[PDB]
Amino acid sequence: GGRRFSEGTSADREIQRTLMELLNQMDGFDTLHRVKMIMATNRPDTLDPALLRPGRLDRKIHIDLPNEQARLDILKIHAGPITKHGEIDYEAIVKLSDGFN
Amino acid sequence: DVLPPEADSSIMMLTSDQKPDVMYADIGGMDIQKQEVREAVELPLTHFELYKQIGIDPPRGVLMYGPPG
Amino acid sequence: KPGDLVGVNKDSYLILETLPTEYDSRVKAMEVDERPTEQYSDIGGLDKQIQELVEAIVLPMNHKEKFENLGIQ
Amino acid sequence: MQSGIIHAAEEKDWKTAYSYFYEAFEGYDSIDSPKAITSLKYMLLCKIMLNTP
Amino acid sequence: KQYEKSENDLKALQSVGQIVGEVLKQLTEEKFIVKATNGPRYVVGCRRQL
Amino acid sequence: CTKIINADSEDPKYIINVKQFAKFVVDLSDQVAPTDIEEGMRVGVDRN
């Protein structure tokens, strides 16, 4: 849990405590970055105001949906272990896969 | 026998397996704001007597609202 | 070893003895509902869904050797 | 300039005093003459007490 | 060999078995308030053999 | 008895659970057999 909205469930808060304690321990009661945590989010719906506010943070880095060129290159490395004779198809697959992560 | 009131605290709770290490010198700005908070929180704890001599009720809590970060 | 039941002394707490591992009879009973077989002869509907499912589970279990050789998941 | 004098000698935080002084000089220089003179010496003063050349 | 292995039970019972905790708060080095894994909290000592 | 599996070097023990939420082992003061202690079977056992 994290985002308690105007009102959330009782349940969100009960679990929310486990995150709060870890976050704190690592940063802003200290100046160190030797012990660090990187947080990944995948659901926008529940995201803590506590984290947002710095000193449990300083940067927000968007990890984008793969690019126009980026999908082409993933396809080439993934194809390589599998037996093939060489395909030219990797360009066709990128179009169809427009917006696939 | 008796124990201190300190004993048998939760470790579930924050700030009894952490402590802050910061001070006023360590940050720069909001010097004006720092003096107000300090006046309200720090002085009555350290000194109960100063507030009594003057005759006012020791300082009440401070509500902190503002920009993120 | 883990999952092994043990005896602990009642009077002073030390691990005195060992006891058989616990299993569950209820799980064994639940198993193998493959008979009678269902096939695709009294179960069906939604022609496309059934085809994809045969591709995802059924064929890789028989055709297992090939996947290892090709190197592909 | 005032925020700076109180912070430099009295409260004794040199980083805090100096920073205000830098602004004070730049502001002072335009309209004023005697005031600006003072503020520049004061800039040097914080750092002399800190004892960095 | 046979002797030492059986005898280990004989001594442990005289030592008495152990109720286990994790240390809740360091107030002083003579008494520590300790928290049982089971639950009910206790005051324990520290001996100078460790 | 929640389940029958135990009979570890004595005439069948099983895990019988008293309603103080503690597990105990059984011995004979009548008999003990695969059929006397079963998966569902409740039992009368002594306090000490």
Swiss-Prot record, chain B:
Signal peptide: none
Top-level division of the source organism's lineage: Eukaryota
Localization in the cell: Cytoplasm; Nucleus
Family indicated by similarity: Belongs to the AAA ATPase family.
Role this protein plays: Component of the 26S proteasome, a multiprotein complex involved in the ATP-dependent degradation of ubiquitinated proteins. This complex plays a key role in the maintenance of protein homeostasis by removing misfolded or damaged proteins, which could impair cellular functions, and by removing proteins whose functions are no longer required. Therefore, the proteasome participates in numerous cellular processes, including cell cycle progression, apoptosis, or DNA damage repair.
Complexes and interactors: Component of the 19S proteasome regulatory particle complex. The 26S proteasome consists of a 20S core particle (CP) and two 19S regulatory subunits (RP). The regulatory particle is made of a lid composed of 9 subunits, a base containing 6 ATPases including PSMC4 and few additional components. Interacts with NR1I3. Interacts with PAAF1. Interacts with TRIM5. Interacts with ZFAND1.
Protein name: 26S proteasome regulatory subunit 6B
From Swiss-Prot, chain D:
Range within the parent protein: 212 to 264 of 422
Function: Component of the 26S proteasome, a multiprotein complex involved in the ATP-dependent degradation of ubiquitinated proteins. This complex plays a key role in the maintenance of protein homeostasis by removing misfolded or damaged proteins, which could impair cellular functions, and by removing proteins whose functions are no longer required. Therefore, the proteasome participates in numerous cellular processes, including cell cycle progression, apoptosis, or DNA damage repair. In the complex, PSMD11 is required for proteasome assembly.
Post-translation changes: Phosphorylated by AMPK.
Protein localization: Nucleus; Cytoplasm, Cytosol
Transmembrane segments: none
Name under which the protein is recorded: 26S proteasome non-ATPase regulatory subunit 11
Subunit structure: Component of the 19S proteasome regulatory particle complex. The 26S proteasome consists of a 20S core particle (CP) and two 19S regulatory subunits (RP). The regulatory particle is made of a lid composed of 9 subunits including PSMD11, a base containing 6 ATPases and few additional components.
Highest taxon of the lineage: Eukaryota
Family: Belongs to the proteasome subunit S9 family.
Natural source organism: Rattus norvegicus (Rat)
From Swiss-Prot, chain F:
PTM summary: Monoubiquitinated by RNF181. Phosphorylated. Dephosphorylated by UBLCP1 which impairs PSMC2 ATPase activity and disrupts 26S proteasome assembly.
Residues bearing the modification N6-acetyllysine: K19
Source domain of life: Eukaryota
Subcellular location: Cytoplasm
Chain's role: Component of the 26S proteasome, a multiprotein complex involved in the ATP-dependent degradation of ubiquitinated proteins. This complex plays a key role in the maintenance of protein homeostasis by removing misfolded or damaged proteins, which could impair cellular functions, and by removing proteins whose functions are no longer required. Therefore, the proteasome participates in numerous cellular processes, including cell cycle progression, apoptosis, or DNA damage repair.
Subunit structure and binding partners: Component of the 19S proteasome regulatory particle complex. The 26S proteasome consists of a 20S core particle (CP) and two 19S regulatory subunits (RP). The regulatory particle is made of a lid composed of 9 subunits, a base containing 6 ATPases including PSMC2 and few additional components. Interacts with NDC80 and SQSTM1. Interacts with PAAF1. Interacts with TRIM5.
Family that this chain belongs to: Belongs to the AAA ATPase family.
Name of protein: 26S proteasome regulatory subunit 7
Origin species: Rattus norvegicus
Species classification: Eukaryota, Metazoa, Chordata, Craniata, Vertebrata
Portion held of the full protein: 98 to 145 of 433
